[PDB]
Amino acid sequence: DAEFRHDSGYEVHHQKLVFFAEDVGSNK
């Protein structure tokens, strides 16, 4: 349960931070 939503939101987390640096960074 914990480790499940952990690794899942772990890489997905990197997904959100990468989406912000791609948009925000794109026009930063």
Alpha-carbon span 12 to 22, nearest angstrom? 15
Q: Is 16 annotated as a binding residue?
A: no
Q: Where are the alpha helices (DSSP H) in 1-28?
A: 2-26
Place of tokens 């690794």: 7
Which whole-number Å values give the CA distances from 10 to 3, 6, 7, 17, 28, in the listed order?
10, 6, 4, 11, 25
| Determination technique used | NMR
Which amino acid, one-letter code, is at 15? Answer: Q
Q: Is 9 annotated as a binding residue?
A: no
Which whole-number Å values give the CA distances from 11 to 2, 21, 27, in the listed order?
15, 15, 24
Alpha-carbon span 12 to 19, nearest angstrom? 10
Give the dihedral of Cα atoms 18, 20, 21, 23; nearest 10 deg. 120
Q: Is 14 annotated as a binding residue?
A: yes
Q: Is 20 annotated as a binding residue?
A: no
Write b or e for each residue in 13-26: b if 16 or more Cβ atoms lie within 10 A of its Cβ, otherwise e: eeeeeeeeeeeeee
Alpha-carbon span 17 to 11, nearest angstrom? 10
